[PDB]
Design an enzyme around this catalytic site. Structure first.
Site, short mmCIF file in Angstrom:
data_model
loop_
_atom_site.label_atom_id
_atom_site.label_comp_id
_atom_site.label_asym_id
_atom_site.label_seq_id
_atom_site.Cartn_x
_atom_site.Cartn_y
_atom_site.Cartn_z
N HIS A 1 0.81 -1.17 0.01
CA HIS A 1 -0.08 0.03 0.08
C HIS A 1 0.76 1.41 -0.11
CE1 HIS A 1 -3.37 -2.96 0.85
NE2 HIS A 1 -4.05 -1.75 0.91
N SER A 2 2.05 1.26 0.31
CA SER A 2 2.95 2.38 0.45
C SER A 2 4.24 2.23 -0.56
CB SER A 2 3.86 2.28 2.07
OG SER A 2 4.56 3.33 2.05
#
Lengths: 128, 130
Positions: free
Chosen positions: A10-11
């Site tokens: 997600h990052s």
């Protein structure tokens, strides 16, 4: 058969840092990583997961992810690629790192799976 | 008794990115994160881990780490602070994220431990570099 490692986060910073961490002990493996959305925000997208898959030179891809909310896009890409994805429900860092080091060392796929089986966890967390 | 979350990684980017990921679900918690050596190498050091501990507003710190090679430093830092560290043998991302969301929601310490119990893992990887 060729094998490679794919990391999905997600990052963007998690993906980037994990790739570097892995490369310090696994310089030779086929490794791709992607994190976040195209504008650098937290999330995942079909297109960016697809690109990390297609970018990897190998055709049999051991694929790792962080939060449960990423599993959908991996499954969608799995339906539409000719590559053979094996998606592991293991911790992202510890699982991708272990798999990568084993692959670099020349472990077989069965040997890698046996070790990753020991790390299966419930991937219930979601990003909103 | 207040509680906070501390993230330790071998990578500064992992630490920063995990903090940012957690801040999407947990805006209010006392949260600190650090990775890498002072000189920029991948690794962990006593001083940088100590800084993340001391900078955290809370005195009871639920502490998470990536690879087994970080554990010794965390144990050493624990000896050298009045803060009370609870070091978890759980995955860094999924552990810290789960604990942070619970803490944000006002879960008790015991309730956080309850939910992390199923995440208990051996942390046997040791980083190398040349």
């Amino acid at each position: 058969m060729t094998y490679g490692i794919v990391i999905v986060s997600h990052s963007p910073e998690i993906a980037s840092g994990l790739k570097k961490l892995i490369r310090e002990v696994a310089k030779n493996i086929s490794l791709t990583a992607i994190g976040g959305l195209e504008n650098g925000e937290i999330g995942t997208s079909f297109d960016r997961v697809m690109n990390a898959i297609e970018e990897n030179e190998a055709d049999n891809l051991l694929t790792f992810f962080d939060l449960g909310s990423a599993r959908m896009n991996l499954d969608l890409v799995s339906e539409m690629t000719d590559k053979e994805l094996t998606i592991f429900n293991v911790p992202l860092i510890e699982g991708a790192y272990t798999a990568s080091a084993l692959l670099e060392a020349g472990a077989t796929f069965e040997a890698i799976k046996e070790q990753l089986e020991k790390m299966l966890i419930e991937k219930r967390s979601h990003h909103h």
